Amino acid sequence: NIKSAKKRAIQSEKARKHNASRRSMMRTFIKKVYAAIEAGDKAAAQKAFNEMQPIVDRQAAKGLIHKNKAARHKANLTAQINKLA
Amino acid sequence: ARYLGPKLKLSRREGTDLFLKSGVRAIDTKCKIEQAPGQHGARKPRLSDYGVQLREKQKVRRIYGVLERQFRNYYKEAARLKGNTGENLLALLEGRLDNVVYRMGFGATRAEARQLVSHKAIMVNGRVVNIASYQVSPNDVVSIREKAKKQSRVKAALELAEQREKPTWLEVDAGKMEGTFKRKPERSDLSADINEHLIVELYSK
Amino acid sequence: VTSYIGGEGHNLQEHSVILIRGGRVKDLPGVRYHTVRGALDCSGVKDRKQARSKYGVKRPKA
């Protein structure tokens, strides 16, 4: 480039790699919960929900997503699993 | 920014005496002041409405030594102000610093008073003012500023300042070289021939 | 557009560039512009001594 905003380019790329890693992991756990919910096993779905919950809340804490987004995931999943029986 | 020409031409174009010469000798004996300056001055123009309005306005401009710009300003103010437009305008014209210098002597003519103001030979309350348009405020002084006295011309002007209507608002000191401005001249404290309403309608046309 | 050539005597050939201003001629029907004399190789009227700013004549000594 021109200035040393190239340093920020490197940092943004590295942070994108990391954020894509963590967002993919988180979304995969939620895919698991959704596959359970469309499978109907309220207990398997419950285990999956308790498996994703610390992941998504830890990510919200990290800032990868927002508190509101994590809470929205948890609320949607609780509603689903409760109507799931 | 100053009319550097024959003053008597102006005066006899107005017909009247506008005093641009030191009123020490005469007016007729220096210029043939009854006929217009032209080779056709002996003839007589009709002087319609606009003619008389322009001629009065130019008489005032030539008396006070003001140019058309800043005369339009002396009208813009005194139109903004309160009271009579023409009276406020004549007051704003007597407030000029070369005006009060002349009316208090120190120069036998408005142009001599202009040189006096301009050459830092004057001091409105000590502070050397040299803006010939300085609108002097009431309750103020003029203080002719030593090294500007005894040049014999301020003396001659002080001597010749008599034989003239003594201003009802000045209180000069004639040698102590002080001079006050106790209050602005009202209407009747001036020539009374100058029909200020003509100028007002010229500029409000 | 057509444009008058004020003043007395000009030098205008077919390729001379000139400055055009407004101001009709009132007896040439259809001429609503005036060639600015003394601008853009359109020299000002020779031997003028009054109203020289118009017709672009530089002040003689006289």
Binding site: - | - | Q13, E14, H15, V17
Partner: protein
């Protein structure tokens, strides 16, 4: 402040005929008109780094302003010569150009790497054709292809260059018996000439003794300065040979801005010492815009050499010739084409000013008080007139601006749409000159344009009289005076004006490019 002392400043020109070697030697210099500087410490890392300001020139008779408008900015001249031809008519031209401005010349006889190359013969050629009196600084070693180095007449060594790496790793050698006798002969003929600087040198040598090379180099530099002699060197820029010793000779004989008397100016008109000024860092600012350029990037760029004074980036200046006000924003001094912006220039520098929208060539830039004129009020007259027309009849505004800018740049190139009919006619100084003008129009100010369509007085060598007159009688040409001067023959002829159309080029091929003329409407 000043990076290099004024004494360590050389303002040198490289002028010669065509393809004599100028640009090649300049490239060898950058390794070991286009103004460009260099830092040549020495041949043995001696001579703490000098700043040599080199103004590479054209040698074509078309671009003769491009060399005369740098001659009266230069302080020294490095006249290049080929070794098979030596003095050419083009060589005689730039020679007279330098004699007009009284430049202290040295010479560099290039192309000793060619067959038929000679050194003695070319020295004598200079002495006979031009009029110079040359002192051979070097003498070739190796006739045409065997050329390996030279012998000096001061060091008495052989600087035979190493041809493994180009020309940098030269060796000093034993000046062997290849030529070690003519070496002595010309060494003595050099001493006898350096004795010609003072009576106390006549008494010095006449004691039957050879003086020391230190006070021989000083004496010969004095002689070059007073223009009393000319020092000729010997190299081959294409075979990377001889160039560094010509640079040495440049350091050792050419003048610095202080090795000359002051520059005489004018206060308001010709006075006694009106504005005589000397090159110093403390003087009031004074310069001379020797070249106007048309920046490809900007369209305006003014060359100038500061004679007396120190100007800055932003300093206001006085167009003492034009009587106006000029100001500075960007000052660039760099190689032929590149531009290295700096902050200020001192006396003895050569830089390019910018935004200088008023000063034409040869006009003096100076501080509000400095010389109204600084000489240089004469450049040649165009010799060739042609008309021109763009591809579309209405791009003549583009064309007129292009040919007003190019005319500003080249004061020896006019333009005036003659009001006879309307035709925009172009007056240059040569066929190739006008080719260059038209292609610069097509390339820079892109407008593709196709070109089209008295008592003459001619001078020429007294050998081409028969043909030039056959040519003049070939044209509808009656003549006036059959008078021959002394360095030629002055022909006078009455010829049409719709005629001759190329008389300059016809004449140049006809006269061996050694004739001038004039045709101003009898």
């Amino acid at each position: 402040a000043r990076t290099t002392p004024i004494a360590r400043y050389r303002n040198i020109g490289i002028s010669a005929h065509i393809d004599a070697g100028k640009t090649t030697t300049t490239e060898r210099i950058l390794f070991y008109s286009a103004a460009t500087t260099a830092f040549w410490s020495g041949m043995a890392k001696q001579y703490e780094p000098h700043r040599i300001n080199i103004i590479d020139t054209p040698g074509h008779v078309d671009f003769t302003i491009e060399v005369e408008r740098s001659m009266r900015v230069l302080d020294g001249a490095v006249m290049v010569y080929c070794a098979v031809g030596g003095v050419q008519p083009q060589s005689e031209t730039v020679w007279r150009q330098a004699n007009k401005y009284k430049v202290p010349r040295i010479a560099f006889v290039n192309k000793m790497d060619r067959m038929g190359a000679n050194f003695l013969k070319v020295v004598n050629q200079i002495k006979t054709r031009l009029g110079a009196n040359p002192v051979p600084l070097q003498l070739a070693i190796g006739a045409e292809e065997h050329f390996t180095g030279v012998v000096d007449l001061v060091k008495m060594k052989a600087i035979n260059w190493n041809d493994a790496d180009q020309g940098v790793t030269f060796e000093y050698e034993d000046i062997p018996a290849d030529m070690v006798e003519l070496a002595n002969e010309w060494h003595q003929n050099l001493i006898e000439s350096a004795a010609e600087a003072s009576e106390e040198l006549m008494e010095k040598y006449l004691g039957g003794e050879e003086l020391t090379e230190a006070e021989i180099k000083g004496a010969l530099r004095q002689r070059v300065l007073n223009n009393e002699i000319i020092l000729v060197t010997c190299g081959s820029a294409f075979k990377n040979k001889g160039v560094q010793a010509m640079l040495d000779a440049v350091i050792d004989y050419l003048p610095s801005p202080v090795d000359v008397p002051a520059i005489n100016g004018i206060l308001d008109d010709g006075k006694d010492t009106p504005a005589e000024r000397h090159a110093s860092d403390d003087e009031p600012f004074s310069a001379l815009a020797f070249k106007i350029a048309t920046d490809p990037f900007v369209g305006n760029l003014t060359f100038f050499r500061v004679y007396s004074g120190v100007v800055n980036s932003g300093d206001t200046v006085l167009n003492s010739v034009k009587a106006a006000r000029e100001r500075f924003g960007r000052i660039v001094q760099m190689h032929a084409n590149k531009r290295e912006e700096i902050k200020e220039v001192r006396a003895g520098d050569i830089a390019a000013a910018i935004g200088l929208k008023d000063v034409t060539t040869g006009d003096t830039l100076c501080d509000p008080d400095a010389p109204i004129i600084l000489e240089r009020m004469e450049f040649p007259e165009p010799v060739i007139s042609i008309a021109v027309e763009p591809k579309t009849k209405a791009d003549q505004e583009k064309m007129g601006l292009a040919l007003g800018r190019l005319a500003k740049e080249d004061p020896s190139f006019r333009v005036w749409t003659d009001e006879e009919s309307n035709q925009t006619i172009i007056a240059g100084m040569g066929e190739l000159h006008l080719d260059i003008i038209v292609d610069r129009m097509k390339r820079e100010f892109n407008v593709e344009a196709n070109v089209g369509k008295m008592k003459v007085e001619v001078e020429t060598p007294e050998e081409n009289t028969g043909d030039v007159i056959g040519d003049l009688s070939r044209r509808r040409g009656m003549l006036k005076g059959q008078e021959s001067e002394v360095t030629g023959v002055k022909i006078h002829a009455e010829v049409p004006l719709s005629e001759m159309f190329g008389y300059a080029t016809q004449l140049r091929s006809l006269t061996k490019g050694r004739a001038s003329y004039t045709m101003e409407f009898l």
